[PDB]
Design a protein around this ligand. Structure first.
Ligand SMILES: [Zn+2]
Ligand SMILES: [Zn+2]
Ligand SMILES: [Zn+2]
Lengths: 171, 78, 187, 128
């Protein structure tokens, strides 16, 4: 589920930016620094909705940089294990299905693809289809998957999806 | 008490009588220790029969006869 | 002393210990209490030979020892060590020793469940399927080892699981005679 | 440590508010207008684009009044914000589906009450 939360971040403003428009520069730098970044604790941050407060800028001894602790309201998304989430399949391969859920990308391993499914490599767009052809899962389709687990690496989060349970798969 | 043991792992029968058999569409007896083994790897197929299964596909059913186990589930479904 | 206790003690001693332990236990079985000096002269064992065996019996606490002090006919002090079998601790320790195998056997099954599947053939390092995706290189499209910059293998992880499982299973099958003797001796 | 099926979440996500994809889309659209206005400033990240595309496709409500009506009506019910967010976002067609998707939902409301709530949401939903 998407979450709107207040986040704590410290802006080390370079002295050249002091004087007029300092706080505006802090706001601009905050967006620039936090937006487009991800953290294992809070996940991906989409946008800063507003800033709760700009703390008193502590001048760093020797560094000259001023450390501004900032509280800002932002929207984030984190995948939770043991939960069902709607997803869009991005790439289909014999190894598994790659899917996108907002900022997060989830992978469904072949072992987690239902027994009724089977990969159809001869098809021009790779897809998995059932023996009776009742449902077909391909790229850019509406599917629901179970978050088996969440992993984080290099400021990126990727989860494992499963379609074995009921009400899953193509919807 | 009466079951001599599961073909996969029978220690549970001698260990304690509180554990219950897990039924599958495979019509093949399996038990709780096997459940953990299939969750980590090869969740898609039976350990020996090779028949495909959707992850664990394990349900509690205490009959000793797997045919009755399967037929009772068939009974309800039918 | 019910015969069921003697049979259990003889079965476990001859089953998981050497004949030295069995022979010493049979002496403590034939006679409720025997002096260390008597057992030494009878078994013809050396002091350290018998003492180490007795220390093992002391380790599993299957036997108890009491020390008696008296003055000999010539006036010299004498300290005799009287050993006897403690069926209560023996049955309790074997019950732990056997239920600890079950814990260890199921721990070995859990190990066979947790033993990482992927591995590097160069450095002979095993990688967990969770770490394998961390180690995945999109440029190559396959698993590789960061230290060796070489392909990572996955199929060889079935061999140790299969082999160990046979030992674990065969252990449970052979241990049943002692379990039956225990059920017969719980009282 | 955290499990949605068990309704276990860290304190960091306890005082946090859950937003629907329709509501998140509204926020992103606001951020879009804010970024599109006052031209020549920093361009939006691909993370914004990816999230906007995803949340727009799954947006269950395209009208502010429907979101306010659903939010105000659901708040009346004795349901947790997580349960209401899942309910108003997933929008299951039947009570049985709602119980299947959310195992913690059982016992909160009766089948008729649960189905009636879902039916109301289906009526409140805007179909294209
Ligand atoms: Zn078994
Ligand atoms: Zn089978
Ligand atoms: Zn290596």
């Amino acid at each position: 589920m998407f979450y709107h939360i207040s986040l704590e971040h410290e802006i080390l403003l370079h002295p050249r930016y002091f004087g007029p428009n300092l706080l505006n520069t802090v706001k601009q730098k905050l967006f620039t620094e936090v937006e487009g970044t991800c953290t294992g604790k809070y996940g991906f941050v989409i946008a800063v909705t507003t800033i709760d407060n700009i703390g008193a800028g502590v001048i760093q001894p020797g560094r000259g940089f001023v450390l501004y602790p900032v509280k800002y309201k932002a929207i984030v998304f984190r995948p939770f294990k043991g939960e069902v989430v709607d997803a869009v399949v991005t790439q289909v391969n014999k190894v598994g299905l790659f899917t996108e859920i907002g900022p997060m990308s989830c992978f469904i391993s072949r072992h987690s693809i239902p027994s009724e499914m089977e990969f159809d490599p001869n098809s021009n767009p790779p897809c998995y289809k059932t023996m009776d052809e009742d449902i077909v899962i391909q790229q850019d389709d509406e599917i629901r998957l179970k978050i088996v687990g969440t992993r984080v690496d290099k400021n990126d989060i990727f989860a494992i999806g499963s379609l074995m349970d009921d009400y899953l798969g193509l919807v | 008490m009466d079951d001599q043991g599961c073909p996969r792992c029978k220690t549970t029968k001698y260990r304690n009588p509180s554990l219950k058999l897990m039924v599958n569409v495979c019509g093949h007896t399996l038990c709780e220790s096997c459940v953990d083994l299939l969750f980590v790897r090869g969740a898609g197929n039976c350990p020996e029969c090779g028949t495909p299964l959707r992850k664990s596909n394990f349900r509690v059913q205490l009959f000793e006869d797997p045919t009755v186990d399967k037929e009772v589930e068939i009974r309800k479904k039918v | 002393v019910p015969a069921a206790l003697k049979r259990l003690a003889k079965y476990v001693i001859r089953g998981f210990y050497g004949i030295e332990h069995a022979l010493a236990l049979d002496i403590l079985i034939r006679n409720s209490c025997v002096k260390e000096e008597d057992m030494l002269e009878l078994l013809k064992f050396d002091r350290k030979q018998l003492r180490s065996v007795l220390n093992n019996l002391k380790g599993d606490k299957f036997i108890k020892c009491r020390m008696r002090v008296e003055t000999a006919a010539d006036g010299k002090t004498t300290r005799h060590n009287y050993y006897f079998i403690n069926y209560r601790t023996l049955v309790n320790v074997v019950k732990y020793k056997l239920d600890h195998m079950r814990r260890r056997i199921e721990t070995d099954e859990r190990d066979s469940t947790n033993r990482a599947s992927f591995k590097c053939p160069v450095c002979s390092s095993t990688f967990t399927d969770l770490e394998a995706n961390q180690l995945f290189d999109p440029m190559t499209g396959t698993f590789r080892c960061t230290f060796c910059h070489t392909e990572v293998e996955e199929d060889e992880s079935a061999m140790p699981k299969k082999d160990a499982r046979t030992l674990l299973a065969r252990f449970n099958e052979q241990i049943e005679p002692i379990y039956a003797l225990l059920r017969e001796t719980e009282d | 440590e955290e499990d949605a099926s068990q309704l276990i979440f860290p304190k960091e996500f306890e005082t946090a508010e859950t937003l629907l994809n329709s509501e998140v889309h509204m926020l992103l659209e606001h951020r879009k207008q804010q970024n599109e206005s006052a031209e020549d400033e920093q361009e939006l990240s691909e993370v914004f684009m990816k999230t906007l595309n995803y949340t727009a496709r799954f947006s269950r409500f395209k009208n502010r009044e429907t979101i306010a009506s659903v939010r105000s009506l659901l708040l009346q019910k004795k349901l947790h914000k997580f349960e209401l967010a899942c309910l108003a976002n997933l929008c299951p067609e039947t009570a049985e589906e709602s119980k299947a998707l959310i195992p913690s939902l059982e016992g909160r409301f009766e089948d008729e009450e649960l189905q009636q709530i879902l039916d109301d949401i289906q009526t409140k939903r805007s179909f294209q």
